[PDB]
Write an enzyme that holds these catalytic residues in place. Sequence first.
Site, PDB file in Angstrom:
ATOM      1  N   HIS A  68       0.844  -1.218   0.000  1.00 49.01           N
ATOM      2  CA  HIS A  68       0.000   0.000   0.000  1.00 49.01           C
ATOM      3  C   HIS A  68       0.871   1.256   0.000  1.00 49.01           C
ATOM      4  O   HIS A  68       0.746   2.085   0.892  1.00 49.01           O
ATOM      5  CB  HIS A  68      -0.987  -0.040   1.159  1.00 49.01           C
ATOM      6  N   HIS A  72       1.858   1.683  -5.717  1.00 45.92           N
ATOM      7  CA  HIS A  72       0.450   1.213  -5.849  1.00 45.92           C
ATOM      8  C   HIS A  72      -0.433   2.380  -6.313  1.00 45.92           C
ATOM      9  O   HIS A  72      -1.214   2.203  -7.256  1.00 45.92           O
ATOM     10  CB  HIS A  72      -0.032   0.590  -4.540  1.00 45.92           C
ATOM     11  N   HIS A 106      -5.991   7.434  -3.317  1.00 45.50           N
ATOM     12  CA  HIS A 106      -7.025   6.518  -2.753  1.00 45.50           C
ATOM     13  C   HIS A 106      -6.502   5.752  -1.530  1.00 45.50           C
ATOM     14  O   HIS A 106      -7.340   5.237  -0.801  1.00 45.50           O
ATOM     15  CB  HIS A 106      -7.570   5.558  -3.826  1.00 45.50           C
ATOM     16  N   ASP A 107      -5.189   5.628  -1.322  1.00 42.33           N
ATOM     17  CA  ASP A 107      -4.630   4.915  -0.139  1.00 42.33           C
ATOM     18  C   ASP A 107      -3.688   5.847   0.647  1.00 42.33           C
ATOM     19  O   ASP A 107      -2.792   5.355   1.353  1.00 42.33           O
ATOM     20  CB  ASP A 107      -3.917   3.621  -0.548  1.00 42.33           C
ATOM     21  N   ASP A 217      -8.024  -0.742  -8.538  1.00 37.54           N
ATOM     22  CA  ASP A 217      -7.412  -1.117  -7.243  1.00 37.54           C
ATOM     23  C   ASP A 217      -6.843  -2.532  -7.307  1.00 37.54           C
ATOM     24  O   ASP A 217      -5.772  -2.782  -6.673  1.00 37.54           O
ATOM     25  CB  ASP A 217      -8.402  -1.003  -6.092  1.00 37.54           C
ATOM     26  N   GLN A 269      -5.777 -17.704  -3.715  1.00 39.12           N
ATOM     27  CA  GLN A 269      -5.795 -16.861  -4.935  1.00 39.12           C
ATOM     28  C   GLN A 269      -6.964 -17.290  -5.825  1.00 39.12           C
ATOM     29  O   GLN A 269      -7.674 -16.380  -6.313  1.00 39.12           O
ATOM     30  CB  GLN A 269      -4.454 -16.930  -5.665  1.00 39.12           C
TER      31      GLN A 269
HETATM   32  C1  IFI Z   1      -4.351 -10.220  -5.273  1.00 39.81           C
HETATM   33  N1  IFI Z   1      -5.032  -9.227  -4.457  1.00 39.81           N
HETATM   34  N2  IFI Z   1      -5.211  -7.969  -4.812  1.00 39.81           N
HETATM   35  C2  IFI Z   1      -5.864  -7.347  -3.811  1.00 39.81           C
HETATM   36  C3  IFI Z   1      -6.148  -8.256  -2.768  1.00 39.81           C
HETATM   37  C4  IFI Z   1      -6.911  -7.911  -1.555  1.00 39.81           C
HETATM   38  O1  IFI Z   1      -7.614  -8.748  -0.966  1.00 39.81           O
HETATM   39  N3  IFI Z   1      -6.842  -6.630  -1.052  1.00 39.81           N
HETATM   40  C5  IFI Z   1      -7.406  -6.176   0.231  1.00 39.81           C
HETATM   41  C6  IFI Z   1      -6.248  -5.113   0.321  1.00 39.81           C
HETATM   42  C7  IFI Z   1      -5.702  -5.687  -1.027  1.00 39.81           C
HETATM   43  C8  IFI Z   1      -5.567  -9.471  -3.184  1.00 39.81           C
HETATM   44  C9  IFI Z   1      -5.479 -10.812  -2.536  1.00 39.81           C
HETATM   45  O2  IFI Z   1      -4.493 -11.560  -2.615  1.00 39.81           O
HETATM   46  N4  IFI Z   1      -6.597 -11.149  -1.841  1.00 39.81           N
HETATM   47  C10 IFI Z   1      -6.789 -12.327  -1.130  1.00 39.81           C
HETATM   48  C11 IFI Z   1      -8.077 -12.601  -0.528  1.00 39.81           C
HETATM   49  C12 IFI Z   1      -8.332 -13.757   0.160  1.00 39.81           C
HETATM   50  N5  IFI Z   1      -7.313 -14.660   0.292  1.00 39.81           N
HETATM   51  N6  IFI Z   1      -7.346 -15.816   0.958  1.00 39.81           N
HETATM   52  C13 IFI Z   1      -6.044 -16.264   0.858  1.00 39.81           C
HETATM   53  N7  IFI Z   1      -5.662 -17.467   1.422  1.00 39.81           N
HETATM   54  C14 IFI Z   1      -6.686 -18.151   2.201  1.00 39.81           C
HETATM   55  C15 IFI Z   1      -6.189 -19.598   2.413  1.00 39.81           C
HETATM   56  O3  IFI Z   1      -4.861 -19.675   2.940  1.00 39.81           O
HETATM   57  C16 IFI Z   1      -3.871 -19.011   2.154  1.00 39.81           C
HETATM   58  C17 IFI Z   1      -4.285 -17.558   1.873  1.00 39.81           C
HETATM   59  N8  IFI Z   1      -5.166 -15.436   0.125  1.00 39.81           N
HETATM   60  C18 IFI Z   1      -5.989 -14.411  -0.246  1.00 39.81           C
HETATM   61  C19 IFI Z   1      -5.728 -13.216  -0.998  1.00 39.81           C
HETATM   62 MG    MG Z   2      -7.389   0.982   0.143  1.00 38.16          MG
HETATM   63 ZN    ZN Z   3      -5.471   0.525  -3.083  1.00 33.79          ZN
END
Ligand code: IFI
Ligand code: MG
Ligand code: ZN
EC number: 3.1.4.17
Length: 313
Positions: A68, A72, A106-107, A217, A269
């Site tokens: 963040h 970004h 935004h962040d 985002d 993922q």
């Molecule tokens: C790629 N990307 N871009 C933005 C975000 C995001 O959420 N935001 C919020 C601020 C950036 C993500 C991301 O990776 N989200 C996630 C969401 C849920 N899960 N659940 C696991 N797993 C569960 C089981 O165990 C292993 C991890 N990984 C993830 C990764």
């Molecule tokens: Mg944000």
């Molecule tokens: Zn952001």
Amino acid sequence: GLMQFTLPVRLCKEIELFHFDIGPFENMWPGIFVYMVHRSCGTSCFELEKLCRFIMSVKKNYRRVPYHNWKHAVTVAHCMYAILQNNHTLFTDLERKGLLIACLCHDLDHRGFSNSYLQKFDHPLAALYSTSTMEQHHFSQTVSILQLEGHNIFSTLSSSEYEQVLEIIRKAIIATDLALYFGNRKQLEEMYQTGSLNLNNQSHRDRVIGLMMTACDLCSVTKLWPVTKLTANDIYAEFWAEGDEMKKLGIQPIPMMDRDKKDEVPQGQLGFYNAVAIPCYTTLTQILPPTEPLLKACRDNLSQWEKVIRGEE
Ligand SMILES: Cn1ncc(C(=O)N2CCC2)c1C(=O)Nc1ccn2nc(N3CCOCC3)nc2c1
Ligand SMILES: [Mg+2]
Ligand SMILES: [Zn+2]
């Protein structure tokens, strides 16, 4: 007035594409942003003296966190630039002004921690803003920087245009709260299908802009696989730091934040692409057909995570 920003040839070409990576040279990101404002908005949208001072104050107010961060901010503004350029006629002059600045801001002043962690820690910001805690902070920080002597890039708007652009920026930044995305996309899905979607309806436009902000985002999932893979490391570096801090409050973290579940990342993922990313770009593509390249890049990256699970990489 006659002073254009010019990029090297490879960047001049690639910056127009949705999957462009802004690269590892920090000193070029401000120039990249001004280039995008000039081509999207116009060379007289902003006073260059004031824009440059605004950009550098915004940069100073992002922190040295793994994800963040300032990179970004500029990454998210470029995805907005690519959406706006591929949709020339759909957006007003005020919207093109407001949205690039929204994306850059935004962040602002992000600590690397989720709204849940602030609440469970009982951080002051959680008392000041009960929902969309960090996002209300980000808008607050944006207003403060705009009110610094010499930083009012909007000064030569009329009174009402100024109130309109600040309202565009506020809604846009609030909309980056992922807790609000689910309800927003479902509403937009119903409206588009039942045929009630109407871009002269301001409340509908707001919803569409909300989805664009979510799409920009999350745009790490729409890059080439090596960029997607290496950004995910930065995302988990923050997540697992938050998980450590939860354990320090004596709370078991959600698996997302738990470094002990590194093994399941490929499956986490999948859930994220299926529950959030693919639905987001699908609905965005239905509303703005020329954003199809984002959905196709997202599906490519989904297929790459499927290959990691099957041990093929
Ligand atoms: C790629 N990307 N871009 C933005 C975000 C995001 O959420 N935001 C919020 C601020 C950036 C993500 C991301 O990776 N989200 C996630 C969401 C849920 N899960 N659940 C696991 N797993 C569960 C089981 O165990 C292993 C991890 N990984 C993830 C990764
Ligand atoms: Mg944000
Ligand atoms: Zn952001």
